[PDB]
Design a protein around this ligand. Structure first.
Ligand SMILES: O=c1[nH]c(=O)n(COCCO)cc1Cc1cccc(OCc2ccccc2)c1
Ligand SMILES: O=c1[nH]c(=O)n(COCCO)cc1Cc1cccc(OCc2ccccc2)c1
Ligand SMILES: O=c1[nH]c(=O)n(COCCO)cc1Cc1cccc(OCc2ccccc2)c1
Ligand SMILES: O=c1[nH]c(=O)n(COCCO)cc1Cc1cccc(OCc2ccccc2)c1
Ligand SMILES: O=c1[nH]c(=O)n(COCCO)cc1Cc1cccc(OCc2ccccc2)c1
Ligand SMILES: O=c1[nH]c(=O)n(COCCO)cc1Cc1cccc(OCc2ccccc2)c1
Ligand SMILES: [K+]
Ligand SMILES: [K+]
Ligand SMILES: [K+]
Lengths: 243, 250, 250, 251, 250, 247
């Protein structure tokens, strides 16, 4: 291998500059199967890699795992191997009443409730998505005709307290995050996920292109396989426009 | 007046929902003159307002003055009068070697080196431009055929120390901003201006649409003093792009 | 012009070392008219400058506009032209029940709710006024016989959320500023304005003398809407004090 | 099928276990369970691989967290929901002190919080401190098998590269905040870099849960960058033995 | 003297490496009396130093005073003279209902509600006690048979607002510390004291060994005013442990 | 026996005194009290020694705070509970400006908050500013006895060594945050380093209490026991003269 964790050489990529980067290792095969000639390359820790062909061009699918820390490893090591465009497809919990289960969300920029983003840029730096990647994702969503919302995402280092979940062992949330969901809601924040702040910050501050799309599987103010499928079809179609 | 500072009533706007918001009061007449039926409304402090017509739709032009504080007054009071879409046209100093004087820059999001943005959202919230507004600006720039760069802008509460200028009375820069320009440069930040962080943060966190475009009148890696001939042309170029962008957002 | 924004040369100042700095461009002529041989020098953006004579000595009057950013430009460029003493005269909203409309307030130091001050000194540095300038202002207020209060001012980068105003488009205040007015009240903070933190910090950390005085045109515990007639009368009273204080500092 | 959102485990699966060994690597779970009696695989979902084993008749859980605090916080919280009250982390690490060699084992008393997830449980001023009984058991377990052990502070980073001041990267640069940071930690007596302890220790100590932290040194930063693969396998096996032995003392 | 404040030479220590460090200058005479051959070395400001002998090995007793600042002076200057191990014995207010008056608490690590710790390490660095020192203290407590609790301590720069006391002149607590006691309680924090954060941070970040033990004289969930004889009983109760722990560390 | 927790004082002990001179050094308390009429010891507990004196007919309290904000906050709070509204601090200091000599007196208008205790009373953005009347009285008192006086900003640190960028220490190092900090303060016109003013000034200004700060320069960092005694007496004579104007 040419990298520490991913178990990949530059030869394995076949000159690929684009990667679709899901959180779940189990999703990698499902995404690649929507493209031509998909093949498993490697699987180490939470990092599962497949290579596939899209319109004649090689494309990488690689899992980051949950959270910024492993995302930062995966994105970086993919960049070392020649990847320049990163497209994240994820799952999410919506926090706006008008967003339904099954809807797809494209993130323009993220609220940085993570730690890893700070290792690339100070907090004042915007966790903003690449304009071309966001454009391609919005266009791809319209192409397949999905209910789409474009806007800001809250990207949290935890699933529970950082997303103000009280149904926990302790049953409590630290002062900093007490009443935080309501605050994000009033600010027009669409949803909660766990990787976008790191991905978008580290790419935008390093000359790498990044896009973010997610399927709504739950609304916090208020099917799962169908939603994931819908979002997977959009992230592949967006990659088509960006090759 | 329905508002504290602008000297405008809701009737003055005539159903306007879009405003073009330059920093310079003197730019307001120049922007309005590019549109149909341009008329002066009010001038109070650094807030000069004109109304014009675009494709039969009333549009507002209102100066913010330099900086987030007066910007925040202008945007708040315009929102109270019915404005939902805000398009900023400004001047800027580029910090990337590949960006030339005369180029136009569209801001996707801003580095928050301001104070006023914090009065609307905590620092972790992105000073991000509205996607439709950014799209319209990029397309408008492509329509008139200008050299355009799209990316991140550093928005500073000062012209001098916050933009790491040493040619000053004290000749020094506070620790926090020492070596900061080099840091932004390495992070791919295009330019320095003084209003976008406040504008973009306050709009994105309040359900208002905002866009940001600027003409490059200086490149900080090449030359210090701006040219008093290209500055006129650059301002004209950017004004034509913002007006065309407004046309797409009506 | 020797400076980027003010449109002034060293000659225009005629050796002046003191500047009176209001926020309102229209207040500039009103201040200069109180002194001898008043003359207009320049008007660019929110910066309007007049020169006058006080006790046979040249004095500058120059508007800053609303907010620290434009204040920081004006002060820096005045310092480059030879100004070493800055006296701010402003308007303010009082937050203590014992301070009435028409009262004058002298600021010893400011709560830094701004961004621009951080570009000159870290937050831990006090936004403190110059002792000689404060003394002259207190004595000048006692000379004309005005109701004066001396103490701490909250200096905000916004007019609305940073001063906990809820009568807005959004109708909400960010967590950081929720309940903040009551907190300042309990801490003995007199009032809200928008420039003192920047002015005082940037001067005290650069060897420049600064003073701050303001006329109360609204009390936030009593009412919200200012009166038209008393506002002009209060401005007149404070302008008299600032000129009288400038007399003592020449 | 599952009493929790991510782990794919019911409380019935645990059989009354109150102690969990939490490695970062999913593939290490099978290795840890093989040291104990009657090992069975319970679930495999995402980065969370769970095995059940028996130690002195008492059931023990081994469950991977994955790299970093975010997934660690999910694993720990969901195991706590299923009845786990004691957590023991076994990991790999890069040492930053010249006197610590490759193959050495490190027990963490407390961690420098260079992570984000810990803040979601307690403000920065709260110490990322390990449980005293867990730390005691780990030190005693290390002395029991006779390993070269160092006890002290660990720097726990949300990144592998810039947060651990690695310059051999795509960008080749480190953000101002972390520039010269390794030297600063070195002077402060910080032993090593890893990626989970700050989250684990903070979230446990602020929620009445017992946590311990042990790691095998596979690289010294003042000596080299690329780890030796032979000594890595030996160090991993060495550290695994200590964490199982420490689990014995805490049951 | 070789130091600025303590008034001691390297000679006066006689090769001592361990120091017991109480806050109360009056406690120094009490701790030194428990060991063989006690003598007064110096009394300057809040620093009183006594030399004693334990198992034929010289041990130093030196008062820090209340708070981090003077603790930072005492520890640093003792370290210059040759002290490598520090054992703090203090008084404390418990905030957990299960901890009674008379109980002894051993601190593994401290919540950093102080300023001095930041002068040695950034906030993210843990205010953790030395493992050997903590072990010796726990074993010493079990040796004499006291009711002991081991865990986290909140170390505050104030006695009143930082420990959320409302029975004060102002009768108020700053926003940051409002509801803070309840938060620490839920996080399993045992108690409040005023020196451990500084001591533990400065030692752990400088290669020095530090331990922390305290006697509970008040319970915040029970009664606010300290008791009669049991208060004096608790001091002598806790003093014996810190000397027995010193025996294990020599 | 006691109305407070630490000082060991009752409201009756004060005799209606509203002003208190607060040195850091417990041994300085007797020195200050001896300059006024009828000096008498009240209490000596921990680091807090209290003496009562009389000035111009009106009673005055002198009480030591000890070094640093934490114990200072105890002293000031408990004195305020007993009826003190005006606090005048007299201290020693290390000057960091080349033009300030050993023996000079410094009056603090406001302080750089390099302490922790001030934050327990007001957030960092709040100015550690001295009371205008107290500062006026101190400046006038210094001019009255004819001392070389400088008025301006003071850096108030929670440590004597690293926070004042001293490298002659056990570790020989200074944490990143304070590395190059002295030079930064110097360029900002900060006069000196001491250890109590930020806490005192913040806690008083945010609680409706009047506070003043004066210090004698015993060392200049850009560049003695006998000079230390003469400087102490110079500043003490000023702080008592300032107390006369404020009663
Ligand atoms: O609220 C969320 N927050 C969030 O950060 N994500 C993103 O993925 C993080 C790891 O699941 C996703 C969601 C939506 C959600 C809500 C409840 C349980 C979830 O988890 C897995 C699961 C799927 C189907 C049935 C039960 C549990 C996910
Ligand atoms: O570097 C900059 N930073 C910046 O924040 N802006 C935005 O406008 C702020 C008010 O000028 C604009 C610039 C470009 C620039 C560079 C040097 C002097 C400048 O000042 C005024 C001016 C305009 C045209 C010709 C001479 C002077 C402006
Ligand atoms: O509360 C205040 N806060 C404050 O920062 N200032 C300083 O001037 C800022 C620019 O107006 C002034 C005030 C007092 C005040 C209160 C309500 C409306 C205000 O606005 C302009 C106005 C003046 C007179 C009559 C109608 C509107 C001013
Ligand atoms: O410096 C470190 N920092 C750190 O946070 N860890 C903890 O595990 C993170 C995942 O490897 C581990 C190390 C040690 C290290 C150094 C270089 C490459 C590494 O990665 C994978 C690998 C293991 C063995 C042989 C070659 C590569 C690990
Ligand atoms: O809650 C506390 N917080 C704390 O930081 N300490 C540590 O000592 C600080 C100086 O007393 C000690 C305590 C316990 C306490 C509670 C009320 C009054 C206290 O003070 C001195 C006193 C001793 C005997 C009789 C009355 C008061 C001490
Ligand atoms: O630099 C200083 N910083 C400072 O915070 N202070 C205020 O007193 C705090 C405790 O002494 C005082 C000074 C001046 C100084 C310089 C060197 C040694 C010092 O220490 C005590 C001493 C007294 C008499 C003879 C020699 C040293 C004091
Ligand atoms: K302005
Ligand atoms: K992970
Ligand atoms: K003290």
């Amino acid at each position: 291998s040419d990298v520490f964790h991913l178990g990949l050489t530059k030869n394995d990529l076949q000159g690929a500059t684009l990667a679709i980067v899901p959180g779940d290792p189990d999703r990698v095969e499902k995404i690649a199967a929507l493209m031509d000639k998909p093949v498993k390359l490697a699987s180490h820790r939470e990092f599962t890699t497949w290579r596939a062909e899209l319109d004649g061009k090689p494309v990488i699918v690689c899992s980051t795992g949950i959270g910024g820390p492993s995302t930062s490893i995966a994105v970086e090591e993919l960049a070392q191997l020649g990847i320049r465009t990163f497209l994240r497809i994820g799952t999410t919990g919506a926090i706006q009443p008008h967003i339904n289960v099954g809807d797809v969300l494209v993130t323009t920029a993220s609220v940085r409730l993570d730690g890893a983003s700070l290792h690339f840029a100070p907090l004042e730096f915007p966790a903003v998505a690449d304009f071309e990647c966001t454009t391609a994702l919005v266009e791809a969503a319209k192409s397949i005709g999905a209910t789409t919302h474009v806007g800001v995402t809250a990207s949290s280092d935890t699933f529970y307290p950082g997303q103000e979940r009280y149904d926990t062992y302790s049953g409590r949330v630290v002062r900093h995050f007490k009443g935080s969901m309501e605050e994000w809601q009033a600010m027009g924040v669409m949803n909660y996920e766990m990787e976008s702040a790191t991905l978008l910050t580290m790419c935008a501050s390093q000359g790498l292109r990044a896009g973010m799309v997610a399927g709504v599987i739950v609304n916090r103010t208020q099917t799962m396989k169908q939603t994931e499928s819908h979002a997977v079809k959009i992230v592949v179609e967006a990659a088509r426009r960006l090759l």
